[PDB]
Structure formats: C-alpha cells, structure tokens
Amino acid sequence: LIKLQIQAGQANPAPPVGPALGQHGVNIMEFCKAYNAATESQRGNVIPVEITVYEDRSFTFALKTPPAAKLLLKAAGVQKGSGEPHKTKVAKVTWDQVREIAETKKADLNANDIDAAAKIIAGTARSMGITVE
C-alpha cells in the first residue's frame, strides 16, 4: 500500500525505490521487468505507480496517467518549473494542450466533465506559475 513516482524507461534506482520496496515485502525484479515493459509500451513520460500488497507477498502495480506536473512541463516546452510562481512566468500554454491533458485526467480523475479536469490542470499550472491561454 504505497505510491511512488519513477522514470518510465529506467528500473532499479538505489535512492528512490530500492529500500522503499525492500521493507514492504515486494519482489523487485518482476515488478521492474513488468513496469519496464509497460512503460516502454507507453515510452512517453515518467509515471507514478501504486503498489498494493497481499498477505502472500503478492504485489499488484497500478499505473496511473502521466502526472499533471510532467504533462504541463512537456506541453509547455520547459524543463524545470518556476522558482517564483506568479512572479516569473517561464512558459505559455494554449487551451488545446490543456484540453488534451484534461481528457487524460478525465481518464484519471473523478471529474464529471472535461472542463473540470481542464480547470484542475489550470490550477496545476498556477502552482507552476505558467500562464494558461
């Protein structure tokens, strides 16, 4: 019953996941190979993965949609977020990318409609100090 964020095409990093997954009773090699296959099928973005454990050390991994942070960063063209949001604006985003990410988050979120997910992404960009147009 944990959740982490890990690079798509990379497996077995020592700081983030190794000891984190070691003390939760989860086999690491099978998870790494299955996750690598899935995220090479995806091949696009780093992903958050949620691990659910059972009493027989069985592990189930749930792969969500790419994060709103990473999706907005890759859609805006910048690499790192603004160190002073709402004071320094480093990128501009149009409504088309916003609606694409809104559809993705509708596949992810509990929002009843696409417009709600678009507003959520706009708030996420506000936390990024990135203008939404």
């Binding site: 020592a14 000891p19 070691g22």
Partner: protein
C-alpha cells in the same frame, strides 16, 4: 597419546573451527583431543589449562585472540583442527585459517541465537564455496534450546540446513543423541558411550527427521530416481544415504547440524566419526589455484605426496628460545628434513590490488613494501604443533600441516615448493585495516629496529598494515579495532624491544594562494667575509587547482642579474615546499610567481642571497594575502542493515558527510556510498560498530583534496 602421523592426503582432514567470540571453541577442541587420547583430562579456558589458549594474550583477554592448530588421527584418518578467534578484530586470522582449510566448522551454543557477526562469518565461509557444518555446543547451559537454534539455522541458511543428529536429553545436561541416518540412540548416562536403538519415545519424530534428511540429501544425490523411490515407499539403504550425504557435503551443498556436549564429552566420538566420514578430503576438496612465479596460470596439483612439491606457510610465530615457528600447509609433493625448498613470498603481483594508502600486498613493513621475494632455504627438523611442545615429524606428505622452526626468512602466506618447480598458491583474502594508529618511538635505537620489528610483525600477522607518513613524518599502524590495535602495540613493544608512544595521526594538508599578492624580499647580512645583498620583487597570483608552479619573468633593465634569476626560482620553490603559514606551513602548490623587479649589489650579490631574497619575497606575498588549506577526502562505502539506515545517515550528517547514494546490497543490507573527510574517519570504525552492533562494515579510499569549509 601417539603422534598423529598421516602418509596419504586422503587420510588427512583440515577443518577450521569458527564462530562467535567465546563460543566455547577451545573447550570443544580440548574435549575432542581428550576423546582422541592426546590429553588425559579436558582443560578449561577459565583455568588456563587448555592447549589452544596457551598464549599470554589469550589468557590475558580470557578469549581467543590468536588462532591455533591441533592434530588428531581417528579411525586411521588424521584431522587438523584449526581453532580461530571469534571476534571481528581478528577476522584476518580466521580468513587465513579458512584458506588453509578444506571445511568450515561453526561452534555455537544453543542458549544463544545466531548473531549478525556469525552470519557474516557464514558469508565469508560461503564465498570460497567452503563446506560448512553446524555444531551446537554448550548443551549443559540451562537455557540451551537445541530446537530453537536448530530452527533458526534451518530458516536462515536456506533449506540446505537440516539436522543430522537428534539429541535426547533432560533439557539441562544432554545425556545422548539419536543417529538419524543410523536410527541409533547414543547414551552417556552411565559415563560410557553406549549406542542402542531408541526406545520409541521419539520414534515418530525420529522418522520425520530421517524423512526430511533423506529428501534433502537425495535431491543433492545424482540419482534423481532416488527421490521417486523414496516418495514411492521404498526405504533407501543407510549406507547409500551416508555416501550420498558425504558426497553432498564434499560438494558444499549441505549443512548438517550435530549437537555436542563439550563439558560432558557427549557426542565427541560420533562427532569424530562424522568428521572422518562425511567431511570432504583435500583430494575431494577443490584445491586452490596454483600459479606460476611469473603470473601465468597453472593447473592445480592433485593432493598426493608424489606430485610436485607444493606447500604454504600459514602462520608465523616468534619464540625467544626456539626462534620462528612457521606452520606450513602442504598441498602437493613431499617435504623431507634437511631439504632445500623454494620460498615464494606471495609474489605480490597477485596481492597488489587496492590497499588504500598502504597498498598492502604482503608482509608490509615499508622497507619491505610488497613481498614478491624468492629464496631457497634448507629446512631443519620437521615438527608438529602440540601446544608449546613440538612432536618431531619424520616426513611431511601432501595434504597436511607442519611446524618448522629456525626459518630465517619464511613468512606467513609464503608458497613453499621444490626449487626446480617454484609455485604460487592463490593467496587468501586479506581484510584491510582502517584504524590508523600513529605512534612515536621512545629512542632512535628503538626506531632503527622498528622497521625490522614491523616487518616481522606483518610476517606474523598479514592483516596489519603499517604506513610511514612521508609528509608529516609519522609512523602509523592501521588496525582492525580496539583489541587488534592493542595486540599490535603490545607485540611491537615486547617482541622487538621497540618502545613507542601512540601519537595523534596527522592528516596531510596542502597550501595554495587564496589571492594575488606581491612580496618584497631583502637578504642583507654583513659577516666577517663577503657581504650579501639581493632584493627580489616577485608577484604571486592564484592559479587553478593542480596548475603547479609557473614562473613569469618581467625583469626590466636587468636590475636582477640574469645569472641569479634561477636562484630566485629555486628559493621560491624551496619556500613553497617549506610552507608559508607560520612555523608549520604545508607545501605550497598551484601558484605562479612573477619576478618583475629587484635590486642587486656589484660585490654583495650571490646566488644564495638571491635564493633567500626570493624565499622572503614569497613569504611576504603569502603574508600579503590569505592561504587556502586543502584537506583530503576519502570515499567510504558502507554495508549496514536497512533498519539502521537513518541512524548512520544522521551520524554522517553530524560528520559532514556527503551522501552519494543508497544501493541495495541485498534483501536486508543497503550499500551507502559517501565521501567523508579523513578527519571524521579517525574514530569512525569504533562508533560505527556501535551504531551497528558491530554490523558496521565499510571500506575507504582516497578521493581528492578539498579546501576546508
């Protein structure tokens, strides 16, 4: 009793007993020797009457601090028992004993569980693929639970650990055991070892144990149809099961458990029987790879007295009257008295890897840096170690261990062979000591013999590293820990008459200019002969790290005579070497000096005067700005359990350590990579063994120099 003499390597066994410190190993060896007939009555470590704990240090610390060898022959099979200390500070002696052994024995007590040091000892035994057998001892203790320890052993080291002998006792003093393979209950209630069928009080449990042991062994048996046959109801023959178990143990695939009462003598006879039957022979044992002198790999020799001569000293001891007592482990060929044999001093090339600052290969002793030495010596009278007594040996066949005295230059780990066929057995793994100990001799007479004494010390103990500082001029002893450092100091202070006083280790430092500055150097002295007058106006400006010394000439009009400019340069270099910070200035590197002006006298100008003027100008320029102090940093890789990660990380946080990454060593330990300044590592080992119930293991290596924060 009789001297145990062996004429064939098959009839010889060389097993090293290992375990925790004070695991009663010495008492077990005494009980086995009494069962062998060499000793009339069993000795006691507390009384100090034991053969193994005969050295002064062992009795002083009331624990095994140095390893010893005992020889016993049983059922026509000779056994070379190698008792080793059970403390982490003496891990190198245990590893040396492991290398000179074809099997590993773990002496543990049922009243205490397997500690982490014992687990690491099992790992070390495992990483030579050594066969391992579990011996449960101290069954007379009230809290001795054979079942609990057995289980723990079965769970920890995989399903390959299954018990071989089932004790039957009252829970206080085990009166005997039940042979699982033989269905025989051994009794010692009347003081006599009696083998009788079990009365049936454990017959169901006995049958369960036979079933489990048979299923475990028979898998390791090459006959895959044996598993079917046993699962089909067929009773596998006892002799066949025995032989399959013997083969599997010789394959280092099974770890049987045999309970032993060292105090009562219960189980010693069967234990000797198991050693003589189930244990691998040196012919059965995978003999270590033998190398040619020039590093070319050579095919390992078969363990036979008729083969090419191949032996290896594994211990060096110093005795005031007898002289050096070198224990020689022989693998191939035959050693005969008065013969001239070749002494291969480890051929350091095979041991020149790593070594940290000391770069320890073999026998250190910086005047003897690396061993790599070859010499042919004529041996004297062959002897076998029996405490301080030496039983003379007529001849030494292959596969046995012997003690040779009066050896002038023979050293521990040296490969002995025929002079016409020099050989080099693969050296043992030498743990790197990481506890530097700077000392100061009390007199120069002691100092002159200090090199000889330290060389002989490293000859006796290959695990001790000695490094003499070239910058701070400090002699520094690298030790494993508190006990090992104390032993190293005492042996140096006694066996060689070298009175030394421990001093503070000096971490080497470097100096460089922190900014541009100029200095005016004047050297005028009016003595009874020629006057001296030389003035140099140099300009010193900072350089990037590692830029070295650069000289730029800007003398206009030849005010400084051009024959004396090299003297100014030499004086500047000498002043950089001698330091620029006070009376204890560290060498100055990565600076540029630009002599642009100066003054000279027609009669009072000399090269020495210009040297002094340049040195004084450099000193003034250094005093005209700040000086950067550069301290070294050593990368440290630590293996610690995952449950203690945070404590060690915070301790390094208080030690200014920069964490590089936390790598999963295994399912329960995490490798921590970090670079720590050498100052913080002076007492890192002792605090870590604290921060880790001793579980703390780390290695260090010099990384680079950095300025002080």
């Amino acid at each position: 009793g009789s001297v145990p003499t062996a004429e064939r390597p098959a009839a010889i066994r060389n097993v090293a007993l290992v375990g925790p410190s004070g695991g009663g190993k010495t008492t077990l060896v005494e009980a086995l020797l009494v069962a062998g007939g060499v000793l009339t009555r069993p000795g006691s470590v507390a009384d100090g009457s034991t053969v193994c704990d005969f050295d002064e240090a062992e009795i002083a610390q009331q624990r095994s601090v140095s390893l010893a060898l005992a020889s016993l022959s049983h059922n026509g099979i000779k056994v070379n028992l190698i008792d080793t200390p059970g403390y982490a500070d003496f891990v190198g002696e245990l590893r040396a004993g492991l290398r000179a052994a074809d099997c590993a024995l773990f002496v543990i007590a049922a009243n205490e569980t397997i500690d982490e040091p014992t687990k690491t000892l099992w790992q070390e035994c495992n990483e030579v693929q050594m066969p391992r057998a579990v011996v449960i001892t101290k069954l007379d203790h009230p809290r001795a639970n054979y079942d609990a320890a057995l289980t723990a052993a079965q769970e920890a080291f995989g399903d390959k650990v299954a018990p071989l002998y089932f004790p039957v006792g009252d829970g206080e003093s085990c009166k005997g055991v039940v042979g699982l393979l033989t269905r025989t209950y051994y009794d010692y209630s009347g003081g006599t070892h009696t083998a009788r069928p079990p009365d049936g009080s454990h017959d169901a449990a006995i049958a369960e144990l036979r079933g489990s042991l048979i299923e475990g062994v028979i898998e390791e048996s090459e006959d895959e149809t044996l598993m079917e046959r046993y699962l089909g109801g067929e009773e596998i023959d006892e002799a066949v099961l025995i032989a399959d178990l013997e083969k599997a143990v010789a394959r280092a695939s099974f770890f049987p458990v045999i309970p032993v009462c060292s105090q009562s003598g219960v189980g010693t006879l069967e234990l000797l029987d198991i050693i003589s039957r189930g244990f691998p022979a040196p012919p059965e044992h995978q003999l270590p790879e033998v190398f040619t002198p020039q590093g070319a790999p050579r095919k390992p020799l078969s363990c036979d007295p008729d083969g090419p001569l191949l032996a290896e000293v594994v211990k060096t001891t110093s005795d005031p009257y007898v002289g050096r007592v070198s224990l020689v482990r022989v693998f191939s060929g035959t050693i005969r008295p008065d013969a001239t044999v070749h002494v291969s001093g480890h051929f350091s090339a095979f041991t020149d890897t790593s070594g940290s600052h000391g770069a320890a290969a073999a026998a250190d002793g910086s005047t003897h840096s690396h061993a790599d030495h070859d010499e042919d010596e004529r041996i004297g009278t062959l002897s076998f170690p029996l405490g301080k007594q030496q039983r003379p040996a007529p001849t030494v066949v292959a596969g046995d261990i012997c003690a040779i005295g009066r050896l002038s230059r023979a050293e521990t780990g040296d490969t002995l062979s025929d002079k016409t066929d020099p050989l080099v057995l693969r050296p043992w793994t030498m743990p790197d000591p990481l506890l530097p100990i700077a000392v100061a001799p009390r007199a120069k007479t002691d100092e002159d013999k200090l090199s000889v004494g330290l060389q002989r010390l490293a000859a006796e103990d290959p695990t001790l590293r000695i490094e003499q500082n070239p910058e701070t001029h400090q002699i520094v002893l690298w030790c494993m820990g508190e006990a090992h450092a104390a032993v190293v100091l005492d042996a140096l202070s006694r066996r060689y008459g070298v009175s030394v006083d421990t001093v503070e280790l000096r971490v080497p430092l470097r100096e460089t200019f922190a900014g541009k500055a100029t200095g005016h150097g004047r050297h005028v002295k009016q003595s009874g002969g020629h006057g001296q007058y030389a003035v140099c106006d140099i300009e010193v400006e900072p350089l990037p790290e590692g830029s070295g010394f650069e000289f730029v000439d800007k003398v206009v009009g030849g005010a400084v005579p051009r024959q004396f400019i090299p003297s100014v340069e030499k004086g500047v270099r000498a002043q950089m070497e001698k330091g620029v910070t006070g009376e204890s200035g560290y060498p100055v590197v990565d600076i540029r000096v630009t002599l642009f002006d100066g003054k000279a006298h027609s009669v009072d100008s000399s090269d020495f005067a210009f040297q002094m003027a340049g040195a004084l100008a450099l000193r003034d320029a250094a005093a005209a700005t700040k000086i950067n102090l550069l301290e070294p940093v050593d990368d440290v890789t630590i293996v610690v359990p995952d449950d203690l990660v945070g404590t060690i990380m915070g301790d390094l946080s208080g030690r200014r350590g920069r964490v590089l990454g936390t790598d999963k060593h295994d399912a329960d330990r995490t490798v921590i990579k970090a670079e720590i300044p050498e100052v913080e590592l002076v007492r890192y080992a002792i605090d870590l063994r604290s921060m880790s119930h001793g579980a703390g293991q780390f290695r260090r290596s010099f990384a680079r120099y950095e300025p002080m924060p």
